[PDB]
Amino acid sequence: VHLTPEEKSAVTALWGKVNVDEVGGEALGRLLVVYPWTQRFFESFGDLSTPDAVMGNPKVKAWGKKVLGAFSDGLAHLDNLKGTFATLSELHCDKLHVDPENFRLLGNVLVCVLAHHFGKEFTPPVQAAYQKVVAGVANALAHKYH
Amino acid sequence: VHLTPEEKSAVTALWGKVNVDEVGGEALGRLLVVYPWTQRFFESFGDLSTPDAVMGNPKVKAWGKKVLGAFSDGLAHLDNLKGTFATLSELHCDKLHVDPENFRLLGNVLVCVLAHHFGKEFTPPVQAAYQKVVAGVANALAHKYH
Amino acid sequence: VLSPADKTNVKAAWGKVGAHAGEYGAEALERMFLSFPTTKTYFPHFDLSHGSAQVKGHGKKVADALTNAVAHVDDMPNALSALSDLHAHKLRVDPVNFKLLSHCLLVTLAAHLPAEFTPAVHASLDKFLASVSTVLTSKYR
Amino acid sequence: VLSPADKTNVKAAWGKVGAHAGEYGAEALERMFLSFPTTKTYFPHFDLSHGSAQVKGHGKKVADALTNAVAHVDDMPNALSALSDLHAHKLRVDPVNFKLLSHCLLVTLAAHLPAEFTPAVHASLDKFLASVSTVLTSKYR
Numbered sequence: 167v168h169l170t171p172e173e174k175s176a177v178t179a180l181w182g183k184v185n186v187d188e189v190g191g192e193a194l195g196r197l198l199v200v201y202p203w204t205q206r207f208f209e210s211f212g213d214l215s216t217p218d219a220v221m222g223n224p225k226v227k228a229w230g231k232k233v234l235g236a237f238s239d240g241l242a243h244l245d246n247l248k249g250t251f252a253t254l255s256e257l258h259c260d261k262l263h264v265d266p267e268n269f270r271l272l273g274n275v276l277v278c279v280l281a282h283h284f285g286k287e288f289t290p291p292v293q294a295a296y297q298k299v300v301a302g303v304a305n306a307l308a309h310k311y312h
Numbered sequence: 313v314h315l316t317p318e319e320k321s322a323v324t325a326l327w328g329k330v331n332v333d334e335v336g337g338e339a340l341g342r343l344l345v346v347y348p349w350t351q352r353f354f355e356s357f358g359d360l361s362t363p364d365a366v367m368g369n370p371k372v373k374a375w376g377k378k379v380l381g382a383f384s385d386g387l388a389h390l391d392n393l394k395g396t397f398a399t400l401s402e403l404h405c406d407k408l409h410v411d412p413e414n415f416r417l418l419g420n421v422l423v424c425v426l427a428h429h430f431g432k433e434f435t436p437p438v439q440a441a442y443q444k445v446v447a448g449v450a451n452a453l454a455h456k457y458h
Numbered sequence: 459v460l461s462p463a464d465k466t467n468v469k470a471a472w473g474k475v476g477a478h479a480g481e482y483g484a485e486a487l488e489r490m491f492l493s494f495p496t497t498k499t500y501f502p503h504f505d506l507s508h509g510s511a512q513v514k515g516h517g518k519k520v521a522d523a524l525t526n527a528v529a530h531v532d533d534m535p536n537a538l539s540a541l542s543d544l545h546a547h548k549l550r551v552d553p554v555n556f557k558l559l560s561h562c563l564l565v566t567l568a569a570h571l572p573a574e575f576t577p578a579v580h581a582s583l584d585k586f587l588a589s590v591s592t593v594l595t596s597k598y599r
Numbered sequence: 600v601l602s603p604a605d606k607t608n609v610k611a612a613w614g615k616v617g618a619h620a621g622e623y624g625a626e627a628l629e630r631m632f633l634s635f636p637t638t639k640t641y642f643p644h645f646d647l648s649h650g651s652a653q654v655k656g657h658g659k660k661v662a663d664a665l666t667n668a669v670a671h672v673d674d675m676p677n678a679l680s681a682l683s684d685l686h687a688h689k690l691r692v693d694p695v696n697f698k699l700l701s702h703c704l705l706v707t708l709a710a711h712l713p714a715e716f717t718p719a720v721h722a723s724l725d726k727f728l729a730s731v732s733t734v735l736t737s738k739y740r
């Protein structure tokens with residue numbers, strides 16, 4: 167993954183404005199709502215019976231915050247996503263056996279969430295830089311499969 | 313991609329029996345027949361109007377032979393598919409803009425062709441070793457996208 | 459399979475687009491070209507730069523096809539049949555690409571309709587665009 | 600969309616399976632488990648080793664569902680509706696996985712029916728399994 171300086175600038179500027187207590191939970195919740203087979207991995211997370219139940223579920227919010235934390239770490243190490251995501255790759259691939267297509271899906275849901283929250287500020291070139299980032303993270307998280 | 317010694321053995325033993333003048337053309341032709349949008353990239357290849365026309369098309373056979381040649385090279389360098397496929401990656405990604413999903417599809421068509429030709433000898437563990445190989449090649453060929 | 463709730467949700471969100479329909483269609487295409495550059499090669503006769511009259515005009519066509527699908531959501535295979543033939547037979551559009559445009563359409567809607575883009579409506583819109591895509595990729599031969 | 604030729608091709612190839620139907624279904628599952636190990640986690644109550652009575656029994660069920668689809672190929676959404684609910688609502692099978700089993704079914708057919716697995720019939724079978732998969736993944740909510 168290769169962001170140009172203008173794309174790194176676009177990415178880091180927007181990210182500074184992100185609420186790290188909320189956005190990750192919003193993405194994970196939306197993943198569970200939009201792509202319901204993903205709920206297969208979150209049996210122990212409690213009530214996921216309605217969209218409101220999912221979005222309000224404190225465990226969804228907590229783990230969403232952990233996901234966003236890993237994205238934040240990825241942003242700090244764009245040139246070594248593979249090492250950054252090594253243990254998470256062992257977890258999601260070797261332990262959980264999550265199909266790696268879902269890493270791409272969560273990346274895109276995160277993109278939709280950023281668009282929703284930032285509106286016109288989430289311009290087409292800003293989106294393009296973020297797509298490079300979420301593809302980079304998905305690919306790194308899938309390394310144990312490759 | 314990590315083949316165990318038993319899987320390398322399974323792979324190389326079968327490959328020694330493959331007709332390198334025919335199998336690649338059979339795979340490429342079948343790709344064009346089974347997944348017809350792929351014909352988009354082969355406009356200059358002439359008559360592709362029927363399955364017989366595709367399978368008998370001398371250019372399909374010739375380029376199929378080049379594809380198989382690249383697989384043969386990949387088999388010889390399983391520990392460096394990325395370097396092995398670097399220039400082909402520039403070609404298929406940067407020049408041709410082929411979506412990398414099609415590399416996975418051609419890999420699987422090749423698998424079906426090997427099953428067709430070898431029958432019961434293409435056992436489920438032999439198939440599993442070949443899936444590791446065609447995933448490895450697809451991933452390497454897509455490196456310029458990653 | 460679109461539920462009654464999905465149909466209501468899509469019609470409602472689409473309702474809020476109004477005069478902006480073609481504009482948002484053009485924006486989705488621009489987002490797709492910038493984010494997923496492989497898709498550019500389908501349009502060698504278009505200049506794809508920002509503000510392109512050709513992309514603006516095409517955006518309106520894409521929007522119109524989507525509103526056709528909304529308006530005839532229970533009979534989409536029939537409504538989009540001609541478009542399906544075009545994209546498969548003539549244009550040979552790789553099926554992966556429909557997922558890319560569908561995503562960029564969702565992103566465009568989220569960037570313009572914050573009140574409407576709830577998680578439920580997000581799911582409804584995604585199912586709808588997947589259904590449209592399924593029809594548009596149903597005619598490979 | 601399955602053409603008349605596709606329907607004929609699938610019925611004909613499937614015709615040659617005969618008593619072997621369940622066996623080939625079990626073989627396809629075994630190929631899927633070995634080649635795509637993520638799919639194993641859907642069957643924690645099965646022993647998946649070679650010669651497994653549970654995999655053999657399940658193979659017969661999978662084969663039966665496929666023959667149901669062949670026999671009612673023009674009404675597949677209805678014929679497979681119950682199976683669709685099961686795989687989406689109860690089992691939560693990831694849609695990517697249908698492509699994996701479909702591929703392993705093609706590989707099994709190619710390994711057993713060399714005269715029938717022509718390029719045309721290969722295409723027909725692939726379209727048919729994709730149609731079956733489309734139905735089996737149509738009920739996520």
Ligand code: HEM
Binds near residue numbers: 233
């Ligand atoms: C960009 C993609 C993803 C990222 C960055 C990510 C990140 C994380 C992080 C940081 C954790 C906490 C790990 C820990 O406790 O040390 C986690 C746990 C988990 N993730 Fe993800 N995740 C991603 C995608 C997914 C998807 C798509 C699924 C399933 C559909 C999934 C399933 C899980 C589960 C089940 C856990 C709990 C693991 C356990 O504690 O046993 N993840 N993930």
Ligand code: HEM
Binds near residue numbers: 351400408410453
């Ligand atoms: C495993 C996947 C593939 C392998 C190993 C492969 C290998 C090759 C090789 C060795 C050549 C000859 C390059 C040369 O002349 O130096 C070639 C050319 C070409 N390939 Fe592939 N290929 C693969 C997949 C595909 C797919 C899926 C498509 C399109 C659907 C495609 C489109 C082309 C085209 C259009 C050329 C001609 C390039 C030119 O001469 O301008 N390839 N490929």
Ligand code: HEM
Binds near residue numbers: 549559590591
């Ligand atoms: C929601 C999905 C899509 C919709 C609703 C849609 C709609 C349309 C419409 C309404 C037209 C004009 C048809 C006519 O003039 O009769 C068109 C043309 C075209 N579409 Fe799409 N499309 C979709 C997806 C795609 C994708 C993913 C691609 C390629 C990446 C694509 C490539 C093209 C091309 C190359 C043309 C011809 C434009 C020209 O040469 O003037 N479409 N599409």
Ligand code: HEM
Binds near residue numbers: 642664685692
């Ligand atoms: C062509 C595609 C498929 C067909 C025709 C098919 C068919 C079937 C049938 C007929 C049953 C038994 C249903 C019953 O008892 O009422 C079943 C059960 C089941 N299927 Fe599939 N299936 C397909 C794809 C898949 C895939 C891709 C997966 C997961 C990788 C899967 C996982 C399961 C599981 C976990 C069960 C429950 C078995 C048990 O717990 O006893 N299926 N399927």
